[PDB]
Amino acid sequence: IKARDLRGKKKEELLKQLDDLKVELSQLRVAKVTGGAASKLSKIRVVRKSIARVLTVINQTQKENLRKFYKGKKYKPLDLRPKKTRAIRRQLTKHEENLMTKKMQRKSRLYSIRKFAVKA
């Protein structure tokens, strides 16, 4: 039930361990209504957070392959695109911001501000 031990496993091994943790939590729900035991009711949260832990490794392993599969593609899915801010996503890209017309390219070439100093 350690996240580091789950990132090395395969997809079918994570689903089997996920299934084993689900049949175990279902039996803890039966003990919760049949009286169970104090040592058995406290295991509910342990199994739940372990299910959340196995299910987390599966999700971020899937998206890691998705972000690798769609790398370099022109169109990426919306959930793989940077969700900075609706206003930030609609700003000019760094490519379009660096675009200079041929008129101000010449204006910045020979009429840029010089480095100088005045005595008094």
Binding site: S26, Q27, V30, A31, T34
Partner: protein, 51 residues
């Protein structure tokens, strides 16, 4: 009713005759799963832990 009937066939491997759903006043849906005549609800209740 079809999701509940298919769920108990996968969790306990038992044929179901009919399912009668019911939403309790506390907001929980209570299912009345009637097993097939060749399955005994007492023997299944012992395996799942009711008895």
């Amino acid at each position: 009713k079809h999701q509940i009937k298919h769920a108990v066939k996968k969790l306990y491997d038992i044929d179901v005759a009919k399912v009668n759903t019911l939403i309790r006043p506390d907001g929980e849906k209570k299912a009345y799963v009637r097993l097939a005549p060749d399955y005994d609800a007492l023997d299944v209740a012992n395996k799942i832990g009711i008895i």
